[PDB]
Amino acid sequence: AFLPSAAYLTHQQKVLQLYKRALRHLESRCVHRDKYRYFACLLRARFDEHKNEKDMVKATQLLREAEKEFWHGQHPQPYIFPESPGGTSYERYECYKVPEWCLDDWHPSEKAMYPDYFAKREQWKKLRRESWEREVKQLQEETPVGGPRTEALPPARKQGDLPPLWWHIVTRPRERP
Amino acid sequence: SKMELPDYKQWKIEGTPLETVQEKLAARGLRDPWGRNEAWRYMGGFANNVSFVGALLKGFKWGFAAFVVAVGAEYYLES
Amino acid sequence: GKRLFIIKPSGFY
Amino acid sequence: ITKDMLPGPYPKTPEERAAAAKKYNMRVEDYEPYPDDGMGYGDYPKLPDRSQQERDPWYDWDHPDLRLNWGEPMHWDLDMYIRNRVDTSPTPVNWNLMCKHLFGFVAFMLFMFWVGETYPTYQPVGPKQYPYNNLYLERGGDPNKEPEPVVHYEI
Amino acid sequence: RHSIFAFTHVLIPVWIIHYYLKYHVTTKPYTIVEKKPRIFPGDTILETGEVIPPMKEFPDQH
Amino acid sequence: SWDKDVYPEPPRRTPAPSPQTSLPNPITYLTKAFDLLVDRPVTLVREFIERQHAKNKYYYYHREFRRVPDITECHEKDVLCMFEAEMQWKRDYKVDQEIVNIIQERLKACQQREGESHRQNCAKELQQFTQVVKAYQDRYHDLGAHYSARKCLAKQKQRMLAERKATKEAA
Amino acid sequence: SFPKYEPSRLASLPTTLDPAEYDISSETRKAQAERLAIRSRLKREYQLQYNDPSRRGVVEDPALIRWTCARSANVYPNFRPNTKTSLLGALFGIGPLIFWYYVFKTDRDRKEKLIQEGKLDRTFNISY
Amino acid sequence: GAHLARRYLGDASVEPEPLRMPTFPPDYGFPERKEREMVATQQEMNDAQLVLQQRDYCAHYLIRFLKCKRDSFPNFLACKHEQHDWDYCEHLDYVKRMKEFERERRLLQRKKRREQREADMA
Amino acid sequence: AHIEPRYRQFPQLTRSQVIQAEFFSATMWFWILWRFWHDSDAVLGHFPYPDPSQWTDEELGIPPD
Amino acid sequence: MLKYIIPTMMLMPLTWLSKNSMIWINTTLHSLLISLTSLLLLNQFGDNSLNFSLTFFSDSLSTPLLILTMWLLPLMLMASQHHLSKENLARKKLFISMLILLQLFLIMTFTATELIFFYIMFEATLVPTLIIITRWGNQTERLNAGLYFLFYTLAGSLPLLVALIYIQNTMGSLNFLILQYWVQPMPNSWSNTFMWLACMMAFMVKMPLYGLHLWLPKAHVEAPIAGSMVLAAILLKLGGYGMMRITLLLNPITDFMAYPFIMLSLWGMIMTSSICLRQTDLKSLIAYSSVSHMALVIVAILIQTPWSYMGATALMIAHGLTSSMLFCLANSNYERVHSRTMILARGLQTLLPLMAAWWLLASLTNLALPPSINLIGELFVVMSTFSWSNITIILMGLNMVITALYSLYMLITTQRGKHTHHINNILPSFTRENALMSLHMLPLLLLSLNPKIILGPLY
Amino acid sequence: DAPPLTLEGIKDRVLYVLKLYDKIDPEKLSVNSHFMKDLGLDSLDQVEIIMAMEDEFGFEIPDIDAEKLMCPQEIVDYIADKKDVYE
Amino acid sequence: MLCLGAMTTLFTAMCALTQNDIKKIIAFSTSSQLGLMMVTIGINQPHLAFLHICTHAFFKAMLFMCSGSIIHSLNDEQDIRKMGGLFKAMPFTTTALIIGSLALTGMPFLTGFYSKDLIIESANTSYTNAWALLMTLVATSFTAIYSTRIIFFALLGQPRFPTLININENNPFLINSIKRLLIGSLFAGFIISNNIPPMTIPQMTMPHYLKMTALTVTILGFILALEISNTTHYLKFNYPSNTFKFSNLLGYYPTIMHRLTPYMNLTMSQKSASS
Numbered sequence A: 001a002f003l004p005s006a007a008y009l010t011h012q013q014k015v016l017q018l019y020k021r022a023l024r025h026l027e028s029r030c031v032h033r034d035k036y037r038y039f040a041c042l043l044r045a046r047f048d049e050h051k052n053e054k055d056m057v058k059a060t061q062l063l064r065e066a067e068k069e070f071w072h073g074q075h076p077q078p079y080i081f082p083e084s085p086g087g088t089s090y091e092r093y094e095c096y097k098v099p100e101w102c103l104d105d106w107h108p109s110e111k112a113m114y115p116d117y118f119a120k121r122e123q124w125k126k127l128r129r130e131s132w133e134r135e136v137k138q139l140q141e142e143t144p145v146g147g148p149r150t151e152a153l154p155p156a157r158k159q160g161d162l163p164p165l166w167w168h169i170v171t172r173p174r175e176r177p
Numbered sequence B: 001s002k003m004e005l006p007d008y009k010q011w012k013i014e015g016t017p018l019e020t021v022q023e024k025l026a027a028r029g030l031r032d033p034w035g036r037n038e039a040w041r042y043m044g045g046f047a048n049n050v051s052f053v054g055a056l057l058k059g060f061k062w063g064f065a066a067f068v069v070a071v072g073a074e075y076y077l078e079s
Numbered sequence C: 001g002k003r004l005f006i007i008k009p010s011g012f013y
Numbered sequence D: 001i002t003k004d005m006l007p008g009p010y011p012k013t014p015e016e017r018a019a020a021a022k023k024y025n026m027r028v029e030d031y032e033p034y035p036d037d038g039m040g041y042g043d044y045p046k047l048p049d050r051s052q053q054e055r056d057p058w059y060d061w062d063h064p065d066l067r068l069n070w071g072e073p074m075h076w077d078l079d080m081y082i083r084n085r086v087d088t089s090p091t092p093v094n095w096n097l098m099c100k101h102l103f104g105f106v107a108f109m110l111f112m113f114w115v116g117e118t119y120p121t122y123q124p125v126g127p128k129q130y131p132y133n134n135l136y137l138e139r140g141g142d143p144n145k146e147p148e149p150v151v152h153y154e155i
Numbered sequence E: 001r002h003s004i005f006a007f008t009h010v011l012i013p014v015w016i017i018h019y020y021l022k023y024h025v026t027t028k029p030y031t032i033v034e035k036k037p038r039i040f041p042g043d044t045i046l047e048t049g050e051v052i053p054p055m056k057e058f059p060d061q062h
Numbered sequence F: 001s002w003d004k005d006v007y008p009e010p011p012r013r014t015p016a017p018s019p020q021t022s023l024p025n026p027i028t029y030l031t032k033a034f035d036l037l038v039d040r041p042v043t044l045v046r047e048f049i050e051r052q053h054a055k056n057k058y059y060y061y062h063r064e065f066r067r068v069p070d071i072t073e074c075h076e077k078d079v080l081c082m083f084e085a086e087m088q089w090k091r092d093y094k095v096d097q098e099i100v101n102i103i104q105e106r107l108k109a110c111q112q113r114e115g116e117s118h119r120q121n122c123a124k125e126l127q128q129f130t131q132v133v134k135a136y137q138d139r140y141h142d143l144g145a146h147y148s149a150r151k152c153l154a155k156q157k158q159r160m161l162a163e164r165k166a167t168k169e170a171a
Numbered sequence G: 001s002f003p004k005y006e007p008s009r010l011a012s013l014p015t016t017l018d019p020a021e022y023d024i025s026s027e028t029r030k031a032q033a034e035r036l037a038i039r040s041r042l043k044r045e046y047q048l049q050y051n052d053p054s055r056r057g058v059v060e061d062p063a064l065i066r067w068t069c070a071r072s073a074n075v076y077p078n079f080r081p082n083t084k085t086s087l088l089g090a091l092f093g094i095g096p097l098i099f100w101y102y103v104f105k106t107d108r109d110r111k112e113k114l115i116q117e118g119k120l121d122r123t124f125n126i127s128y
Numbered sequence H: 001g002a003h004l005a006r007r008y009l010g011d012a013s014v015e016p017e018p019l020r021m022p023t024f025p026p027d028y029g030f031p032e033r034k035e036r037e038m039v040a041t042q043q044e045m046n047d048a049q050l051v052l053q054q055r056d057y058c059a060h061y062l063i064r065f066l067k068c069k070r071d072s073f074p075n076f077l078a079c080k081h082e083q084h085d086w087d088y089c090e091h092l093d094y095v096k097r098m099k100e101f102e103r104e105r106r107l108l109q110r111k112k113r114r115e116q117r118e119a120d121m122a
Numbered sequence I: 001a002h003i004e005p006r007y008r009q010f011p012q013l014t015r016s017q018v019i020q021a022e023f024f025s026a027t028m029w030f031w032i033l034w035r036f037w038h039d040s041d042a043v044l045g046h047f048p049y050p051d052p053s054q055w056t057d058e059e060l061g062i063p064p065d
Numbered sequence J: 001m002l003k004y005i006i007p008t009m010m011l012m013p014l015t016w017l018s019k020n021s022m023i024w025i026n027t028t029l030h031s032l033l034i035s036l037t038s039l040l041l042l043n044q045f046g047d048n049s050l051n052f053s054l055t056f057f058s059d060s061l062s063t064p065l066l067i068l069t070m071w072l073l074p075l076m077l078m079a080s081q082h083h084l085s086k087e088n089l090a091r092k093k094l095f096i097s098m099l100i101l102l103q104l105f106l107i108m109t110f111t112a113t114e115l116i117f118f119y120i121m122f123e124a125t126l127v128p129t130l131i132i133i134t135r136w137g138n139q140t141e142r143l144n145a146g147l148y149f150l151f152y153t154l155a156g157s158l159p160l161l162v163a164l165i166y167i168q169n170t171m172g173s174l175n176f177l178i179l180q181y182w183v184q185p186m187p188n189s190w191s192n193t194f195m196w197l198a199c200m201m202a203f204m205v206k207m208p209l210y211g212l213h214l215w216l217p218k219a220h221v222e223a224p225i226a227g228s229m230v231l232a233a234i235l236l237k238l239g240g241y242g243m244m245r246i247t248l249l250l251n252p253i254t255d256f257m258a259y260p261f262i263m264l265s266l267w268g269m270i271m272t273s274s275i276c277l278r279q280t281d282l283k284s285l286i287a288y289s290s291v292s293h294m295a296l297v298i299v300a301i302l303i304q305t306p307w308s309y310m311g312a313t314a315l316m317i318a319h320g321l322t323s324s325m326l327f328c329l330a331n332s333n334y335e336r337v338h339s340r341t342m343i344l345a346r347g348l349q350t351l352l353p354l355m356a357a358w359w360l361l362a363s364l365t366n367l368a369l370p371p372s373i374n375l376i377g378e379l380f381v382v383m384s385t386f387s388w389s390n391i392t393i394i395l396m397g398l399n400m401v402i403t404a405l406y407s408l409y410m411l412i413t414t415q416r417g418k419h420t421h422h423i424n425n426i427l428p429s430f431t432r433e434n435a436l437m438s439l440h441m442l443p444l445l446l447l448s449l450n451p452k453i454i455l456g457p458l459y
Numbered sequence K: 001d002a003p004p005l006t007l008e009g010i011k012d013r014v015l016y017v018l019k020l021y022d023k024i025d026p027e028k029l030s031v032n033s034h035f036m037k038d039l040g041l042d043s044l045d046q047v048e049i050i051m052a053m054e055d056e057f058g059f060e061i062p063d064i065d066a067e068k069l070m071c072p073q074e075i076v077d078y079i080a081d082k083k084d085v086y087e
Numbered sequence L: 001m002l003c004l005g006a007m008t009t010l011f012t013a014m015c016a017l018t019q020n021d022i023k024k025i026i027a028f029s030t031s032s033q034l035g036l037m038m039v040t041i042g043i044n045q046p047h048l049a050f051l052h053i054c055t056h057a058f059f060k061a062m063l064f065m066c067s068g069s070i071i072h073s074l075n076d077e078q079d080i081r082k083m084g085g086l087f088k089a090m091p092f093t094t095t096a097l098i099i100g101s102l103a104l105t106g107m108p109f110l111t112g113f114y115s116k117d118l119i120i121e122s123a124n125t126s127y128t129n130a131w132a133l134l135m136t137l138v139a140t141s142f143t144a145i146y147s148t149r150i151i152f153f154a155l156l157g158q159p160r161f162p163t164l165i166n167i168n169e170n171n172p173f174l175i176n177s178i179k180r181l182l183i184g185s186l187f188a189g190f191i192i193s194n195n196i197p198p199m200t201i202p203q204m205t206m207p208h209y210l211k212m213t214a215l216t217v218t219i220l221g222f223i224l225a226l227e228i229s230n231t232t233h234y235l236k237f238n239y240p241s242n243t244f245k246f247s248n249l250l251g252y253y254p255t256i257m258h259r260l261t262p263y264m265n266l267t268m269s270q271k272s273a274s275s
Ligand SMILES: CCCCCCCCCCCCCCCCCC(=O)OC[C@H](COP(=O)([O-])OC[C@H](O)COP(=O)([O-])OC[C@H](COC(=O)CCCCCCCCCCCCCCCCC)OC(=O)CCCCCCCCCCCCCCCCC)OC(=O)CCCCCCCCCCCCCCCCC
Pocket: J353, J354, J355, J356, J357, J360, J361, J364, J365, J369, J370, J371, J372, J442, J445, J446, J448, J449
């Protein structure tokens, strides 16, 4: 439905996602580890019973009413991981995630507090500014006519060149700034 | 720097409630694969935790003994 | 040891 | 920004709808404008009335906190449907059953408080007995006058 | 400068607030109004010396 | 200090220290420590400042407004006399405000000073407050934001006609 | 059997309950592929400007400018006076004014009648 | 909590209502009934600044207990004796209120027996 | 020496935290039983509550008619 | 008052005879000296107004507005000297001269003894504001902004011109001091009804009244910074000043003719605050907030109790300082992202912490946090309207709820959340911008210590 | 709080979890042991492996990235990218 | 005040029974105690309510601090379903959390006794709304239920947190900060309630069932929630009810009124106000 690489979820992907959501909401219903492990192997056997169903329509039907069974038997407040979206510590440190370009606007009396760091930042920005036009001309020699098809980015194929559109992935802030 | 791990072999589930879980799964032709991962919660220094009525009575022995000592002290003090 | 540089905006001004 | 990339009038021909859908960067069949009834929308698209909480949060969004892409058309209430405001996320329980349970519980509690006010609890005693004629000079009575004697006896 | 905290943060503000309340607040009427102290049977008024007489003898209960 | 007639106080009657228990209270030692550390040097600084006040003594005064003719004996549309009448009435209105404030301060000081027995032992201040509020309400209430001695004289004439009709309907 | 989920305006339908999610029909394949093509074109067009070292400024989003120009500037030129908007503008624009007019007028007539007949408790009221 | 069920779920004419009572004269049934002595003088409990809920017929023990609590500072447990005296006299005053309640209950039972004997005889 | 993290096992305990925990739990049970030994009327009851049915008629002013 | 009019006129040879790099420094310096001198108007008395000459007087209503007017000129010079840094020198001196000429018209608008001279100055203040908006404005629709500015302010003021001359022919004078003592009760008739409307609708446009307010979220939006500052700080307050002068003559017909305008303002303070909850444009949000706060001043003038006029003048001074600071904050971010869209650049506390503190202070003074004079004005108007009718407390408290909501939503949207990834020209805060914020907020915070100077003629 | 992770520590812990899973014998497991082709595991078993990684390291791996990790070296590198180790 | 406080202490302590985040549960605990304070204001006992403020400060601050020590020792794990096995792992935190729970429920002669027990003893013996008193007693049971819920899922049982143990609490800041409130929650109720002057006349004469009522309903809540706790280890998988979905989804009032009322004030503000 909504994915970065492809446009859809396959049938096998929806089976695996229902399996994972069913185990997580089961663990939310079944707090203790051993009781969860008992009912989790029971649910795993319930999945593996119709593992070899060759009819795609019958497999889609069993997946659909399995989603119905799951929607009835879900936990109201499922355990969300804390840094996962919906958790308690999700996007908590984003107020400390200052982007990298703010170092360039420092006064020189506080750029002199870290001479080796900015003496290295200059050669990082040098590497970026001599990689930019080569990776742009890499992008326009590989993109098909009518635009790109998927959102998947191509790698660097040559030696000496860097992968295209790499600066805000390599120089992103840390999870604990 | 280096963090050493304890040996993976020692987390056998014989002696845990995972043993009872694997017995009730073998009662219907099933085999539990994820027992030894969860074995550490039911072994070692976390095994044999207290119940609630013993968790309330933590320090009840020493506290009651000091109670008896201090009541005897104020009983022998008043004369 | 292994101290990390903290990116923060310009506190001079 | 230029004039043929601004919102314009309501499209009535299919080629005007095609130019509008190309302007708003979306497919023509998915391009549903608001109905032309004077509410001031023009050719603006009717995004399907969801919040931004329902969006896939692990996607590498152009606008992460908005869960929004660059060039993707925005809902007319995009500032309303942010995660700092109204959530239209699906609930485990239906909306009507939630309204039934909450209204029934509140109304039942209010009725039982009123009935318990109608039938109070008390103790098997008389009123408290106060000297100096129910504390007349203490409750602010005027000392030029003299009230009735409130005499309390033994029992 | 070893207990400079208890000097600078206490003993100088006690001086300032005591000078303030003593020569600019209580010299103005009804600024610091105090509830009058509680008089019992058996006390002695420090302004007069009159001993407040004790209560009537109790109809003892136990 | 101030005038003890306009801000009256009942005589202070504190009880004597009658200790019973064997333990010494902390408050006598805290009082003597506060005395020897604070109450003496603050007094010494005030004595030095008082000497510097006594080195150059000079006086300020209270302004006296003599009574000019009021609005009842000023001609209609005669701004030279009714300006004086209006300034006189505005100063009297501000002084009446401060009278009501003084009686409020008496009432509140009595309520706190009497504590729990305030409902009994502050009937005099409550009576004075009710009288001065009834007078201020009959005199200046509902005149509005554009109040004047003309507005107050018109209110007084309407109230006097109401009282005259209330007296005439009782005889 | 199981209680069927009832989608409302404030609680939409989950994707795991939608019947039209599991359509493997090729018009849905083409629609998802064309939406993916549009989204990929806009994604590449964004991050070409976003990863540029020569840019020091705002990557302007024409959808945002278009959103603000819709929310502010395109209201009167695409308004038409019809029955719905007229009854809404008289129902909601002059309606509460008339309602609060009657409420505050009735309250002030009642209070002025109680004052000019000498019934309203106005003993200590001297601040107004 | 049985008289609650005797006033609510049975009949209400025989149970004494809490809000307006006593409905009988204090001399109705008592040969030479005596008043309650007020031990604390009015100016005394005016000077000790007692709460108006606490200015009842047993305020002299409360005056002595507050005087003890002041005179035994900082020893806040040295006046358990006067506190027990005040609390036991509050207990006795509550007993007197219970006796007023039971008096009114038995006199309403007397009115019920009177009207039933009159409805049987006449 | 600060506490070093272990793995899938019971963590290293200080002597001090365990003796303070036992000390305050023993102080809790001491204080509860001590105040139960002294007061015993704030829990159970201060005075006997009299039965209104057991009362006589003469103390309540009941002429038998 | 001539001792302030003559230095304001000497600011013109001070700005036209300066060196080309010295035209901001000299005008800022000498306008700060004139604002230093403006505090000599505080010689007020409990009975009498400070009556200078036949032409000028200054009671305790005009005095805080005069101090605010003479203080606002250096702040406008500081605020406008960055976006005009690439302007022609002659046009730059013309901009400074329009600001000085506007100050000159304002400071003898507030001191006009006679009401047709008040009218002449009150309508003379339009034309520098006209030139500022429709010369140094930003976008395409600045010419429709001033056209609806000039049309609404003249179509309201035109029956006021006939009404003041009708007072001149009937009473004999338009001196306010004479009409204090020669005012006659205006009875119930249709002639006196349209008389009341002619005397009031001009200032109803200038406040603005709800329903007549549609010039303002274009005239404030399409203005430059000095124009928006002077519009939200003084030119809205000219209506409250004129109403407080003109309701002396309109009694007792106000006591039953004020009801529909009290309804319009009491409901428009709810409507425009709800509109502030859904503005995509930050400068529009501050504009509709200005309408929502001036609605209370309209209610407090139309119910004409002493607490109401005290709260209304306190609220005018407080809102002038607060809204001027909020427009300067919005310009400080517009000088970096070049867009007034509020949802564009977020998370700005992660990049500008001290400016986020100034945003926080301006937001707290926006929602009337005690003990600010914002809350003093808000609270006194609420007290007087509760005395007026007890049911109005619902509308007042509901307005205060929505006020705190849009204030803190503006704070959250502009200052908090995740910052924008594709915006990288966010400079550190200049010393000029923080000087502008501090010279707004520090007088507003100091006026909480001694609030009696901004509480009008009947304190 | 929160001791720092290394590639050695993540590798040791991921192989430690995969040596406690009964469908993998401990001698055939390596850093590059692909789960489907080499180790003979199922897709569902690989999903449970990802869930064991989530329970081990205390964060959710999304399904679009869970369904692409098909060897322990990719799992270690993905946790290394999501936690920024060797800083 | 009596009806509103009884409604608050019923609804919040009933919503606390099936929440999963520990800070949510202690927030419903303090809101239920504030409802009890509103109740005892409503029975004309203002000084008992203020004494219960001063009492409640110590142990409810201590319970939030113990939950914070648990959260920091489990790396921002705020959910009670990933806790447990912390009896010996965090002994000082276990100790102070149990002492705070007993002070919350009304253990005899801790700090919470001298306020809450007199609140219930004065709420029984007064001319009172009877349904309000009954809901107050139901809330009194619910306090013991969620207190042993916090102790059970947080401390008792076996671990559920992830495998890397970072459990550490041996810093004198944390130890002294919980220690001084621990001394407060042990002694300050006795100290304050025997330093305060008498401002009302306390009801000390009452029948035996009516004197023991708070303690009895508290212990019965303990017993019923011990049954609820022991029915978790069983190998039974119960489908959720409507009472569980009511108390687990916050009573549906933070669900509807945080969607319905912000819908109207945001759409009428444009489609009927702005546009
Ligand atoms: C006449 C003589 C008078 C002398 C005394 C002065 C009287 C008050 C004047 C104003 C004082 C504050 C001015 C500076 C603060 C604003 C800028 C700022 O935050 O800079 C941070 C900076 C330090 O922070 P940083 O770490 O570097 O950077 C901050 C970060 O960026 C991150 O920023 P942040 O968010 O962490 O920091 C912002 C923070 C944000 O804080 C908040 O949001 C919390 C505030 C609200 C709640 C608490 C207060 C509620 C009200 C109760 C208290 C008032 C009444 C008390 C009386 C008893 C009760 C009635 O604000 C503060 O910390 C300021 C503390 C004081 C707040 C006052 C109230 C502001 C609230 C809004 C209005 C409320 C009503 C009006 C109250 C008026 C009181 C006079 O401060 C300074 O550098 C201060 C510079 C010097 C200031 C001089 C002030 C006087 C100027 C007047 C000149 C003429 C007279 C001569 C007097 C000379 C005195 C030396």
